[PDB]
Write a structure and sequence with these properties.
part of a larger assembly, 2 chains, A: 7-stranded mixed β-sheet, 17 strands, B: alpha/beta, 8 strands, 10% strand, binds a molecule of 2 linked components (NAG-NAG), binds 2-acetamido-2-deoxy-beta-D-glucopyranose, electron transport
Chain lengths: 443, 348
């Protein structure tokens, strides 16, 4: 409100060019009046930067209006990834890390617990896509693959199809990132599908944990929350201190003070943004603040919360380069004191065989479905496996035949000595395999 | 030129009747002043309640973010014409922008087709301070992976600037920078001497239209077309969209925009493919034009931009079909003659 803004501005002036101060803004239900209010404020105040901390439930109108005239502004509440890119919002800056940082910490946590597997359950929104891209890039830099990256559908019900696909996969670990409504819907389906427990580990972001915990969060999740998220909602003191330092650092011209009629942009606006990036506000209030990349600062610690005892608890904090887990033992969904294995063995291998006369014979089955059993040259049962493959190249659709020979005999020996459970399956089109070029893509 | 544009639209454009909408030529330029422009737009939307008004801008890009935000708030489609201040804006929120610009992906695609046709394999990807150009570099890498496009690599980078740019050479150069930042690069290149007939520069991005002797920039087709054609195209697009939505109950007003998000519904589902003025005028979900018409302008010694090649329907027709690349116009190029002798030279 006004009182907090006056206190923050007064403190900034006392901290220590001409009558430097900031004027608070009042949010409106419709952005149309919001844009008009900010336009009047900029014309009158003509302040170098504007601070937006509206807890709507909107930072778009302020950033969009700041784009014109190239007047950089600082946002302190929104964490959506759409503001990370400066191409669309070239006048938007913030200190809180973006949601892509959640992917960075997830990879660090995954590497900490000797996990190399994941089932990335990501929403289809822009924020979800950015998180997947950031996680994929980090995994690629480490020569690691995400296995399944099956997408999602915002504001959709009956999503059991995706859950069924994930369940059949070997790896049992899911890093979920979506909205509160999506998180609740997925959690309900997972609970009804026996997916929350046994050897399953859940990793979710701040929004997912809060929303899921409200409605249907099982007591086996592992959520992440900002160390000073609530304080970040009222840490404008750091913002005013950094802005004052940036202006004190720096051939400049006063920003335009005319909103009713103007086309010229601020010449020094880009320079002010450049100096702001170089600014290193190492005061230490609410942790060290250092802008990273463009539009965000990657210098905020991240805490880990768990739903043990039906309540959120702290099981460690992130130092900025490595996690520091020192709290009580983590209560996994199954209740075991040891971290459940993130990978599950799959002893149901499917084998592809190609018809070669000396090695893998192919013979049709009898009427009953099982082909006749013969004897070897010296006298002995011949091991035959019921294989499925094309008839001609005629049903031409998975006619069940029976295979036998060198390779099949070798396969049976391998299965016995290591516990397989094989289901032979002939190649769809008879061809050993080669690299063909299609649409300028050889691989 | 805002006053001139308004005068050119009130008089000439009003009488224009391309083609259903009750009143087609109903519109008003209405003068830069975002507060007044938005207030006037709301007043017209509440009163006129039209199905959209074509917007024309002359400034050479902050207008686009406000226009799309206003369109999303009003839940009405507003087509962007008269290239400039409407250059792509790839990201979008639900809203119907329908801008008539040209995206970088197609611009890069056309340039590479021209480079391959002219046997210009060697190239560089010099770039200034990153204005979020990571996408441009990725697209070039994707296009490079192929059969023949591969060539010498490059990077992104005042005496220091001149040295960095001149340390890769490779003749053909690809430039992506803003006008405010490109000028220092041009001066640095001029100081380094890589601005004469011995080098060719391909400047792509939002540049539109000491300059180097060889400059090739790709811009949207009809860039030199008069504003009358631009407004006519915008009106036709709106009329085509109305006809497209006419396949079902066409009495679907926007409730009067939003003056005194909530709807969360776009309009791209119905308006997807239209045909007018031949060419390829079809809009995508992102707001671009699928398979748009492009031309390759070139700069001569007379400071004039002329069409060299035209791209339409995945077809590249270019005049000045120089079979030889003039590789050594800056040696390493040899003009080797020969003759057909079956045991030695076999030609098929
Ligand atoms: C900071 O200084 C500016 C003037 O430079 C003050 O702005 C005035 O504020 C009053 C009260 O809201 C308005 O009636 C005037 O129209 C404003 N003038 C300008 C030039 O903006 C501003 O109030 C001061 N704020 C603080 C916190 O002291
Ligand atoms: C966060 O901690 C700081 C400590 O200085 C405190 O002043 C602030 O009020 C806290 N956050 C909130 C909003 O309670
Ligand atoms: C914490 O992160 C900082 C980043 O500079 C690093 O220097 C420090 O060694 C890290 N400490 C631990 C325990 O991870
Ligand atoms: C392999 O070992 C497992 C565990 O004892 C057993 O269940 C399985 O039957 C054995 N071999 C197979 C796959 O038949």
């Amino acid at each position: 409100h006004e009182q907090m803004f006056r206190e923050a501005v007064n403190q900034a002036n006392k901290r220590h060019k001409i009558q430097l101060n900031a004027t608070s803004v009042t949010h409106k239900p419709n952005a149309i009046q919001m844009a008009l209010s900010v336009c009047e404020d900029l014309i009158s105040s003509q302040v170098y930067a504007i601070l937006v901390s509206h807890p709507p439930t909107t930072p778009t109108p302020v950033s969009y209006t700041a784009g014109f005239y190239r007047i950089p502004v600082l946002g302190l509440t929104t964490r959506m990834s759409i503001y990370s890119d400066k191409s669309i919002h070239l006048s938007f800056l913030r200190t809180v890390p973006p949601y892509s940082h959640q992917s960075s910490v997830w990879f660090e946590m995954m590497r900490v617990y000797s996990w190399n597997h994941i089932i990335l359950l990501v929403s289809d929104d822009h924020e979800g896509r950015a998180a997947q891209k950031r996680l994929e890039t980090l995994l690629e830099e480490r020569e690691s693959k995400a296995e399944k990256v099956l997408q999602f559908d915002p504001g959709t019900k009956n999503v059991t199809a995706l859950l069924m696909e994930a369940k059949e996969l070997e790896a049992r670990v899911i890093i979920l990132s979506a909205s509160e409504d999506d998180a609740a819907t997925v959690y309900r389906a997972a609970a009804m599908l026996n997916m929350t427990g046994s050897g399953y580990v859940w990793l979710v972001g701040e929004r997912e944990i809060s929303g899921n915990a409200l409605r249907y969060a099982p007591d086996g999740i592992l959520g992440l929350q900002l160390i000073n998220g609530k304080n970040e909602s009222a840490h404008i003191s750091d913002a005013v201190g950094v802005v004052a330092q940036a202006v004190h650092e720096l051939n400049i011209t006063d920003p335009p003070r005319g909103c009713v009629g103007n086309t010229n942009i601020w010449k020094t606006g880009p320079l002010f943004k450049r100096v702001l990036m170089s600014s290193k506000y190492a005061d230490g209030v609410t942790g060290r603040v250092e802008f990273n990349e463009d539009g965000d600062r990657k210098f905020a610690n991240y805490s880990i919360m768990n739903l043990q005892n039906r309540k959120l608890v702290q099981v460690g904090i992130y130092n900025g380069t490595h996690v520091i887990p020192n709290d009580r033992k983590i209560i996994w969904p199954g209740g075991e004191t040891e971290k459940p294995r993130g990978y599950q063995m799959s002893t149901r291998l499917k084998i592809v065989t190609i018809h070669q006369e000396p090695f893998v014979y192919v013979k049709p089955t009898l009427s009953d479905g099982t082909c006749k059993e013969e004897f070897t040259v010296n006298g002995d049962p011949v091991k035959k496996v019921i294989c499925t493959g094309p008839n001609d190249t005629s049903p031409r659709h998975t006619v069940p035949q029976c295979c036998y020979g060198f390779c099949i005999d070798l396969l049976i020996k391998l299965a016995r000595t290591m516990n397989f459970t094989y289901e032979v399956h002939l190649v769809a089109d008879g061809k050993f395999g080669t690299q063909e070029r299609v649409n300028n893509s050889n691989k | 030129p805002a006053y001139a544009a308004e005068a050119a639209r009130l008089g000439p454009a009003v009488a224009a009747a391309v083609r259903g909408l009750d009143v087609r030529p109903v519109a008003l330029v209405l003068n830069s002043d975002p507060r007044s422009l938005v207030l006037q737009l709301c007043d017209l939307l509440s009163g006129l309640r039209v199905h959209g008004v074509v917007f024309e801008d002359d400034s050479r890009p902050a207008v686009a973010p406000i226009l799309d935000f206003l369109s999303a708030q009003t839940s009405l489609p507003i087509v962007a014409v008269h290239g400039g201040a409407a250059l792509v804006l790839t990201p979008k929120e639900g809203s119907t922008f329908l801008q008539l610009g040209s995206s970088t992906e197609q611009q890069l695609q056309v340039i590479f087709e021209v480079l391959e046709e002219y046997d210009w394999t060697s190239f560089v990807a010099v770039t200034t301070r990153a204005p979020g150009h990571r996408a441009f570099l990725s697209y070039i890498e994707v296009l490079t992976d192929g059969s023949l496009v591969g060539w010498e690599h490059r990077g992104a980078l005042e005496a220091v600037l001149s040295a960095q740019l001149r340390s890769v050479s490779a003749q053909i150069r690809l430039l992506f920078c803003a006008r405010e930042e490109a000028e220092p690069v041009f001066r640095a290149a001029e100081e380094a001497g890589l601005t004469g007939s011995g080098y060719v520069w391909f400047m792509v991005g939002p540049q539109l239209a000491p300059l180097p002797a060889g400059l090739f920039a790709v811009r949207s087709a009809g860039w030199r077309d008069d504003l009358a054609r631009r407004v006519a195209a915008g009106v036709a697009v709106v009329a085509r969209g109305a006809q497209a939505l006419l396949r079902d109950y066409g009495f679907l007003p926007e409730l009067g925009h939003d003056c005194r998000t909530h709807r969360g519904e776009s309009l791209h589902r119905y308006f997807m493919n239209i045909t007018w003025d031949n060419r390829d005028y079809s809009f995508n979900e992102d707001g671009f034009l699928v398979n748009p018409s492009l031309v390759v302008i070139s700069l001569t010694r007379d400071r004039t931009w002329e069409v060299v090649g035209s791209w339409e329907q995945q077809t590249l027709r270019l005049k000045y079909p120089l079979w030889s690349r003039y590789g050594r116009f800056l040696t390493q190029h040899l003009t080797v003659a020969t003759l057909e002798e079956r045991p030695f030279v076999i030609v098929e």
